[PDB]
Point group: C6
Chain length 257, copies 6
């Protein structure tokens, strides 16, 4: 999925628009967890029937969300044969102490992170992909920028440590194996891809996060609330592909409505 | 009641639906205390007439609630010959210092607990069953999860203690006999069953708490507020039974309707 | 009055219901102070005309209330020839430092207390009867329970003191003569009767307070706000008499209507 | 005015009811400073025209109010030939540091006090009469009780001091001459009369304050807001006169409406 | 302007009433800042056209207001040939650190002050007149009284200082030259006139402030909100003139109407 | 641009008014950010179509805004061939740690500053012009005044330092090269022009900021919300040109209508 865009969709017809626009994958969900999160409601796993109806409408991979720590929601979604599971902070947490033991599943997981310690704990638990936490539903890109900047800074700062005993102290505070931290410092990057997510609203935002070093982008239900969803979706895809070309970015950004 | 579901019911017709869906017992209550706790009202024992009309309508066991410390409410319910009494934090407490002396009744009691100390105090007073406190009426499973995790953890932490003097110190703080704590540490579990309660909303939630080591499940009035109550009740019963079979859990979770 | 129920009444016809239901006395009042507390109003002694009209309607004793420290309100009520005076915290206090010199009157007084020191000060001032304070008008029994439990706990705690000098120090702090405290510690009880009051809502509540050691029960205007006042009044009287009979308590508690 | 009742009145016809009921004096005022004090308004001296119209309607003495420290309001009221001036905390203060120099006037002044130090400062400034501050407009007698109890207690406590140097220390803290304090301690009372005021609502209240040692009572506009003002006014007068007679107090308190 | 009254006016017809009543000057303003200060609006210099239309309507001197620190607003008003400028705290401040350099203008300025230090800083900057700040729009005279009392008191307290080094210390804290402070202490007064302002509502209020040692009086838009504006304005003028004649003060205060 | 006025415009017809009134440049924007700040909305770069439509309407320079740190918004606006970019705090910031690397662009940038350290960091990053921050949309000039006064005060304070090591310590704290701070202390000014911005509401406000040492003036959408926009725009241009002429400032400030 490297270099691609993943789009949130709430109906089979929305999924078809995403596919036609050039999305790499879709995220199936029954409710927008930003509308009812401001209603006070509890947000859970979506009904397996609505997820299956979306799986049957497109040929590209389909992802679905589960609550933090809800390993039974994950068992059910795995049995449904989805392509990826997102253990998501946007839904209402089920366990405020323990995340899912992701290394007991065959299906790959994506998790959010806002700093280096969080990213490594999620990977140690078994995550196959990392993304920014951002701030979902607001359309403010600054959160996602903060998280990618912070991870990059913390890797460079640990690389300046000359004492192996000092490195071991850092790993202990992070609650991860010293061998995982040492691997990051040798490569100068996380062992898995890191995608942008939360508050990506415009084609310019998508290109900004790619220039900052992200491997792809997630976009939310904001796409389908615009005056012309097809045009906006297509523009975000083009901007992610051609992220280093100012003339193309100008072209796709003009007269968006 | 090991491995079963107990359902809150407010009418005789609701009790019949619970029985048909495969519930192991029903809890009789005249009003939902969660709906009242938002108005300032005092919530007490239900009228014995409404409890009896429910007892007359089903052949499965029937439970009823009393206020914390209200031993006369409990004497009345025992005389009515209900099957179990819940000394409940959801009702308005009658005594803020002392709980009921439960070992002086014939009928068994269930009590709530959030940690190991609280569980052991309720058992020492005479409780026959323990349950999580959770957060009643919210539909959020996370409080029930917190409580089962905490009890399990505090047992393991006390098992690491090498000094018998330190163990006696712990029991003193808990205000329980040292012999009760020692039995728990040797067995690795409470001496009575521990059920999930408060915030169980979906079949997946019921199976989650059974996988965490609960012995059964209490569910609330949310069942009867859904678009299809009999379908939801049956699905919760099936998930509590088949709690570690993923193909069955997918089957019962599909096309559930609006919760 | 011992073993009996005293009922608040606002009209002659309410007094007649109380008498027929088996009350031992009535308390005459022109306004429900709990209704007037919500209005921010000052609550005082009732008009002597309305009290006299109640006195003429029944052949059981009649009590009336006065503000804390208002010795002139008490002089007027004594001249009217009422049977007892309640120096009451439910009315708006008149003197925040000094209570009435009750030993200068011929008519007996009842006073409220929340702990042992308070009870002994009221007795030293001249009170003939003590009652719990509770929380008047809320229908929550927990405050009356707290007060009776406290007094009992403080007596037991003082009974553990070995030094007479230490006992003398406690009496000085309480502002009462040492001879009064000594009598209480020898006999394990107050020298006058102690009734339950404030927040007694159901027959079960009345029997609970009698089992905790109270000598009788005061009930408020909640009786006459229920669906069937005569039925509820009679049930509270029966529960106070038969407080240690679970089968009888079940009988009178069933099908009571809305409370 | 010893043993008498002074009544607040807002019209000439109200003044006539007060006189017929047996009042010793009336207090003339255009507005009730409890209604508009809860409206946020500034309360001042009343119009000299309305005061004169009341003076012309009755034969008994008439009093009027001025703001704390407003010595020009007092000059105007003195020129009008009223019988007494009340420098009153119920009106909006004009000077939050200095009270009126009352010893520069011919007309006598009444002032409020809540403790011994306050009472002596008001007398030192020139007051001819003291009254309780109470709490006006509320009908709660407890304030007035507090103030009479406090003055009595503080006199008795100073009388227990055996050192004349200790007495001088007390006077210095009170900001009054040592010879004024020493006079009080010798007599066991203030050198001027002390009346009850603020929150006197019923005949029982009036008798209570007289039994506590007050020399007379002030009553407010509550009288004229009752169902039967003539009956209530007459009952308060009888209760003040016969303050130590329970049978008479019962008689006047029955069927008041 | 010694011994006179200055009146706030919002139209040419209001200015004519002020002149006929005996005012010594008028203050031209397009809106009452007290009515706006409750809405959050920015209050600035008035439109020069409205100020000129007032100047054209009367033969007495005319004043106008500028924001604190706004020296260009002052340059515009000076070019218009108004008679006096008020650098006013009632308008929205333009500079929160620095006031206008008033000694660089030809037209005289008036400034507000709450204590001796503040008065001396305004004089050092070049003010020709001082006034109390009071509390504008409230009708409460007590703030104006506080300010005149404080200045008078702080002068007397500084006069008790026996050390010239201590005097220099005081001037340093005030941020003024020692020669300015010393002149005040020797004379027992400020080197310029000091007028009452903010909260003057009645004729008695005007005479009160003159008896306290003020040199004249500013009055606000309250004059024109009364039932009879010409009667009230005339009475305030007469009381400011005859400020220590009680028979005259009684005469002008009688039958004033609703304020 | 030096000595001139830059005006915010939301349509081609507004741009034409600005040009005819004598503006030196226009700032193109699709929404008034002050109106959108009240709505809680995110404010971003404007649509390139609306900017181009304004570019086609006038023959004076056109500027456009981007979010703080949003270097891709800046890349797009540069490709459009606008004349200047404003990296603006009035839009919703994109990067709360890092501003744009402005020296990597061909198009010049303007940035805001509230003190000397901030001004020098923006210049070191590559800014061609500095402006005050002020308080955008409120019409209160005091914040722009505060910022210009601060920068001047801090230059004078640093000029008093005798030690080169002390100067080096100040530069380290500011996070700028010592050579940049040294140049400012020698010449008594910034190396680039500094314009007034934020809260400039009247002609008098514009002239005030020019007299305080600003090089030119930015004005906001308040111009086009007044009764007569062309009249107000022309008056602000004339006041900026003739800032030290009191008779001219009186002329253009009179009879302006509602603001
Ligand atoms: O990834 C680096 C960005 O492109 C620019 O950020 P910077 O201000 O740290 O140079
Ligand atoms: O009972 C243990 C659970 O099934 C797994 O939880 P955990 O691995 O996060 O501790
Ligand atoms: O007065 C004793 C009560 O009946 C029971 O109280 P307890 O629970 O503390 O034993
Ligand atoms: O003035 C004394 C009162 O009549 C009674 O008050 P007391 O409680 O202090 O005795
Ligand atoms: O200027 C002094 C006043 O006229 C009187 O005030 P005072 O005696 O309270 O200090
Ligand atoms: O920049 C100097 C200003 O024009 C006047 O300021 P100032 O009042 O501090 O002298």
């Amino acid at each position: 999925l490297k270099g691609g865009v993943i789009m949130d969709v709430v109906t089979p017809e929305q999924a078809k628009i995403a596919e036609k626009s050039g999305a790499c994958a879709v995220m199936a969900l029954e409710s927008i967890p930003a509308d009812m999160r401001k209603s006070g409601k509890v947000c859970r796993m979506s009904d397996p029937k609505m997820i299956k109806d979306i799986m049957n409408s497109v040929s590209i991979p389909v992802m679905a969300k589960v609550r933090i720590g809800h390993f039974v929601e994950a068992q059910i979604i795995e049995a449904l044969e989805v392509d990826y599971i997102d253990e998501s902070e946007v839904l209402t947490p089920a366990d405020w102490t323990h995340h899912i033991e992701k290394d007991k599943f065959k299906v790959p997981f994506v998790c959010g992170a806002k700093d280096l310690g969080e990213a490594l704990r999620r990977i140690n638990e078994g995550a196959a992909m990392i993304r920014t936490k951002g701030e979902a539903g607001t359309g403010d890109v600054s959160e996602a920028v903060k998280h990618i900047r912070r991870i990059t800074e913390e890797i460079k700062a640990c690389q300046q440590l000359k004492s192996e005993d000092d490195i071991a102290k850092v790993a202990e505070e992070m609650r991860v194996p010293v061998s995982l931290l040492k691997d990051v410092l040798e490569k100068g990057k996380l062992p898995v891809v890191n995608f942008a997510a939360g508050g990506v609203a415009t084609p310019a935002d998508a290109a900004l996060l790619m220039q900052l070093g992200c491997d792809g982008v997630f976009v939310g239900s904001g796409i389908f609330k615009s005056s012309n969803p097809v045009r906006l979706a297509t523009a975000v895809v083009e901007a992610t592909t051609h992220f280093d070309n100012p003339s193309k970015l100008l072209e796709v950004s003009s007269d968006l409505g």
